[PDB]
Structure formats: structure tokens, C-alpha cells
Amino acid sequence: KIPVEADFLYAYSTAPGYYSWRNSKDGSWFIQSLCAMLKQYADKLEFMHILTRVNRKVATEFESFSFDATFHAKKQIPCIVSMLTKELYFY
Amino acid sequence: KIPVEADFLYAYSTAPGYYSWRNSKDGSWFIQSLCAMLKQYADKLEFMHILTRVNRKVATEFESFSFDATFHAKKQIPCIVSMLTKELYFY
Amino acid sequence: DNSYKMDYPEMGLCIIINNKNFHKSTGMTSRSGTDVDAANLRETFRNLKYEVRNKNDLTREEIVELMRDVSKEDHSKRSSFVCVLLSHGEEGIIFGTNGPVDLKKITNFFRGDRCRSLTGKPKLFIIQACRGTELDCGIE
Amino acid sequence: DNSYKMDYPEMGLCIIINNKNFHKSTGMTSRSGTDVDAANLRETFRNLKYEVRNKNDLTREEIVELMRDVSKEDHSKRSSFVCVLLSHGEEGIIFGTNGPVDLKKITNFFRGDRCRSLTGKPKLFIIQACRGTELDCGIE
Ligand SMILES: *[C@@](=O)([C]N([C])[C][C][C][C][C][C])[C]([C]C(=O)[O-])[N]C(=O)[C]([C][C])N1[C]=C(C([C])([C])[C])N=C([N][C]C2=NON=C2[C])C1=O
Numbered sequence: 309k310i311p312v313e314a315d316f317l318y319a320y321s322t323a324p325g326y327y328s329w330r331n332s333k334d335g336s337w338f339i340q341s342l343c344a345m346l347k348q349y350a351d352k353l354e355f356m357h358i359l360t361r362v363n364r365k366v367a368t369e370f371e372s373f374s375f376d377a378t379f380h381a382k383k384q385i386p387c388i389v390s391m392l393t394k395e396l397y398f399y
Numbered sequence: 400k401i402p403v404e405a406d407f408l409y410a411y412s413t414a415p416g417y418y419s420w421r422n423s424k425d426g427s428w429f430i431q432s433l434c435a436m437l438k439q440y441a442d443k444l445e446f447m448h449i450l451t452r453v454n455r456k457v458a459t460e461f462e463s464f465s466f467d468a469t470f471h472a473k474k475q476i477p478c479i480v481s482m483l484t485k486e487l488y489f490y
Numbered sequence: 491d492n493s494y495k496m497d498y499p500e501m502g503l504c505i506i507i508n509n510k511n512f513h514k515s516t517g518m519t520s521r522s523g524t525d526v527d528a529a530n531l532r533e534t535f536r537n538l539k540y541e542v543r544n545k546n547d548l549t550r551e552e553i554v555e556l557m558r559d560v561s562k563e564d565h566s567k568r569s570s571f572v573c574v575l576l577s578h579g580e581e582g583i584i585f586g587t588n589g590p591v592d593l594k595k596i597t598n599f600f601r602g603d604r605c606r607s608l609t610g611k612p613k614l615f616i617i618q619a620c621r622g623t624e625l626d627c628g629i630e
Numbered sequence: 631d632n633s634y635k636m637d638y639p640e641m642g643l644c645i646i647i648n649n650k651n652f653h654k655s656t657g658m659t660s661r662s663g664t665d666v667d668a669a670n671l672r673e674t675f676r677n678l679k680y681e682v683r684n685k686n687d688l689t690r691e692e693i694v695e696l697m698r699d700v701s702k703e704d705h706s707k708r709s710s711f712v713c714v715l716l717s718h719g720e721e722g723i724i725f726g727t728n729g730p731v732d733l734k735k736i737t738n739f740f741r742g743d744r745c746r747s748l749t750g751k752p753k754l755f756i757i758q759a760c761r762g763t764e765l766d767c768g769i770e
């Protein structure tokens with residue numbers, strides 16, 4: 309008998325209550341980071357560590373640029389929510 | 400420049416919106432499972448992996464037993480929320 | 491064994507819902523650049539051996555209906571399930587082209603007792619959308 | 631470097647808030663067993679080399695006050711920060727012996743621009759408390 313909420317993983321692009329940024333030509337910071345991270349490590353790293361790399365890439369390599377002072381020079385941190393019971397490997 | 404919400408890790412004993420269980424003599428299912436896994440794996444496993452082991456142990460080895468049918472035979476799954484930017488090792 | 495069995499005949503489905511244009515009656519702006527993500531995810535997950543299915547501009551009704559039908563499929567020969575949502579949102583909400591949809595609703599179709607063929611298997615929900623209106627100004 | 635620097639002179643503080651007895655007016659039941667958790671956590675983190683500080687039955691005011699003070703301490707020589715909350719709770723809330731406290735309230739004290747000596751360092755919040763009134767009946 310296991311919890312019905314068990315084995316779920318939610319990879320949020322941003323922290324609870326926050327905005328999530330998207331670039332007009334490159335796409336969202338989170339998705340482009342997730343794809344790039346999966347490309348380099350899907351064959352090596354356990355999924356959680358890949359998502360942690362995504363957290364670092366988004367948090368460091370991205371910042372908003374807007375003529376609108378309110379939305380200028382903003383940052384973002386993704387939010388990994390795991391109810392997983394085992395480690396996940398894409399191989 | 401990094402997000403102000405970065406490098407936080409919330410190890411919740413249970414999923415969003417759910418009850419959390421405690422045993423009158425042994426303590427909560429989550430805490431005792433967490434301490435057990437840290438004692439056995441803190442010297443080798445990365446933190447997220449230890450927490451995933453906690454998830455499995457809580458969802459697998461615990462079930463409520465109550466004279467009150469409404470609260471009888473229930474299960475629990477913890478909830479790991481990570482805004483971490485790097486892997487965490489306690490050594 | 492503390493690692494999910496990923497050696498089933500197939501890795502599983504990867505449903506990608508990409509919403510770019512929203513009804514005027516909503517006031518939601520067009521999500522320029524989202525197509526890049528959609529195509530990017532399709533290639534990434536194809537390389538991972540997932541059966542990818544792209545769905546564009548779906549109403550809330552179409553989202554719930556789609557997710558409900560996917561959960562009723564037989565996942566017995568599939569190692570896992572992946573759902574990607576690309577749209578506007580609020581905390582716990584993602585927008586169909588015509589209105590809000592609570593994430594809990596589409597996620598419930600796949601909860602243990604709900605989707606027997608996925609029980610004990612990893613169910614991933616990758617969400618690109620806002621969860622509020624707080625801005626992170628950063629530090630250092 | 632994809633792993634946190636944990637070679638500082640000290641691993642850091644481990645603040646454990648053990649709330650067992652609640653004011654009659656709250657209608658909260660005594661949390662039998664919580665002491666076993668507090669003691670267990672104390673020994674565990676002592677072995678991990680954390681400077682452990684146990685606090686028992688704190689009011690909403692005292693929890694906030696303690697968290698503010700701790701965040702105002704100089705963590706320069708510390709690798710990380712750990713806070714464990716044992717108590718009754720609701721979604722995004724933890725109870726002091728005399729009432730509710732928003733988790734966002736005590737968590738904010740340590741956010742990037744707020745606790746400079748911990749910026750870039752892992753901040754862990756271990757929470758044993760309910761997050762609602764939903765029950766999980768399990769499957770299979
Ligand atoms: C997000 O889901 C929904 N937002 C818009 C909240 C709606 C809830 C209703 C509350 C009243 C959405 C994410 C998505 O992928 O579409 N977020 C955005 O649209 C984000 C918000 C931070 N966003 C906003 C804006 C402006 C500044 C408001 C026009 N611009 C961009 N991109 C352009 C940009 N400007 O500066 N840097 C960049 C990359 C954006 O992503």
C-alpha cells in the first residue's frame with residue numbers, strides 16, 4: 309500500500325508566488341535551461357541533480373532587461389518539488 | 400547576482416494540503432525516517448538522494464492505526480521542495 | 491532497489507501543451523518564444539526515447555479532456571509519464587486559451603488509485619508559467 | 631564546482647523548535663512523541679557537526695523573535711543553516727504555542743539580500759506539521 313500522491317515530481321520554472329520569465333526569441337529561461345541540461349547530462353546524472361543544475365543555470369545566467377524600471381534587472385530561481393520514491397535515470 | 404529566493408530547501412513532512420502523521424511513542428513518521436536515513440547515508444549520499452530515501456521509507460513503512468475509522472489505515476508521502484543551486488553533502 | 495525501473499518496452503508518453511495565443515476575453519498576452527520551447531522539448535524528449543505529443547492553443551476544456559483521456563490509456567508497457575505545460579498562470583493554476591485551470595485537477599487523473607497502469611511509476615510535470623506577481627530583484 | 635563549499639570552520643547552526651504544549655484557547659492537542667523527535671534530531675545533527683540549539687514551546691512572537699535574531703547573527707564562518715520546526719500547522723503555516731505563524735515570515739529573514747553572511751549558502755527548513763486536512767488512503 310502506497311500514498312496516491314507518491315511518485316510525482318513537479319519541476320516548477322519559478323518559486324511559489326513569483327513571476328516566471330520568457331525571452332521572445334530564445335524561449336523561457338527555464339525551458340531552455342532544462343533542455344540544455346538534459347542534453348549534457350541525461351546520460352550521466354540522476355534527474356534531481358540535473359534539475360539542480362537547471363536551478364543554477366537559470367539563477368546565474370539570466371536577468372531581465374526592460375525599458376520598464378519595474379521589470380528591469382530581475383532574477384529567477386526554479387522550484388523542484390519531489391514526491392518521488394526512487395532515483396530517476398533516463399537510461 | 401543571484402535570486403534572493405535561491406539556496407533554500409524545504410523538506411516538508413507531507414504533500415501540500417495533507418495531514419502529517421505522528422506516533423505518540425516513536426515520534427513523527429517523517430522525522431524518525433529522516434534521522435534514520437541521515438544516520439545511515441549522510442557520509443556518502445547527496446542530500447536530495449537521502450530525502451528521496453526518506454520519501455520511500457515514509458510511504459512504504461508507515462500506515463495509521465486508529466479506533467476512529469475516519470483516520471484509520473491512512474498513508475503519507477513527504478514533499479521535497481528545492482531551490483538549491485548545488486549538491487549538498489554533509490562532509 | 492532505490493532506482494525506478496526504466497527498462498519497460500517504452501520510456502512512456504511526453505505530452506507537451508504549448509499555449510501561445512489567448513482569447514481577447516482573457517486579457518492574456520501572446521507568449522512569443524514559446525514555440526521555441528515546444529520544439530526544443532520535443533527534440534530533447536525524443537532523444538530520451540519518449541513518445542512525444544505536441545498540442546497547441548488548447549482551451550481549459552481541451553486541457554482537462556486531454557489529460558483525462560491520457561490517464562485512461564494503458565501505460566503497462568511504459569516506464570513513466572511526462573507532461574509539460576507552457577502557458578500563463580497563477581499559483582496552482584495554468585491557463586487554457588479561454589481561462590484558468592487548477593493544476594490539481596489535471597494532476598489528479600494520474601494519482602495512484604486513479605491511474606493504475608502508472609502506479610509506482612514516476613510522473614513528471616514540468617511547468618513553465620507564473621505562480622504569482624512577486625519579483626526577485628536579486629542580491630550581490 | 632557543482633557542490634556547496636562545506637569546508638568552512640563550522641557546518642552551521644541547527645535551530646530546532648519543539649512545540650508540544652499549546653494554549654487551551656487554541657484547541658490544539660498535546661503533540662505526544664514530539665520530544666522523541668527533538669532528541670533524535672539533536673543527536674543526528676550533532677553527529678553531522680552542527681551547533682544545535684533546542685527551543686521548546688515557543689509562542690508565535692518568540693518563534694519570530696528567535697528567527698530574526700538568528701538571521702542577524704554572523705554566519706560568515708558557517709557553511710550552512712538548518713531550522714527544524716516541529717508543531718501543528720496548515721498550508722504555509724506553523725503554530726506557536728499560542729497561534730499561527732506564516733512560514734514566509736520566518737523564512738524571509740534568511741533570504742539572499744536579508745542575511746548577507748548566508749548568501750550563496752544552503753538554507754534548510756525541515757518541517758514536521760500538517761499542510762491541510764486531506765487524507766491519503768493509499769492504493770494497492
Ligand atoms: C506567467 O505565467 C504569467 N504572468 C503574466 C502572470 C499572469 C497572472 C495574472 C495576474 C494579474 C508568464 C510566463 C510565460 O511563460 O508566459 N509570465 C510572463 O509573461 C513574464 C512575467 C515576468 N514576462 C513579462 C514581461 C513584461 C515586462 C510584463 C512585458 N516580459 C517578458 N519578457 C520580455 C522581457 N522583458 O525583460 N526581460 C525579458 C526576457 C516575460 O517573460
Ligand SMILES: *[C@@](=O)([C]N([C])[C][C][C][C][C][C])[C]([C]C(=O)[O-])[N]C(=O)[C]([C][C])N1[C]=C(C([C])([C])[C])N=C([N][C]C2=NON=C2[C])C1=O
Pocket residue numbers: 418419420421422423427462463464465467470661717718719720758759760761
Ligand atoms: C498537523 O499539523 C495538524 N494539526 C494542525 C491539527 C489539526 C487536526 C484536525 C483535527 C480536528 C499535526 C502535526 C503534528 O506532528 O502534530 N498532525 C496531527 O496531529 C495528525 C493529523 C493526521 N495526527 C492526528 C491524530 C488523530 C487521529 C486526530 C487523534 N492522531 C495522530 N497520531 C496518533 C495516530 N492515530 O492513528 N495513527 C497514528 C500514528 C496524528 O499524528
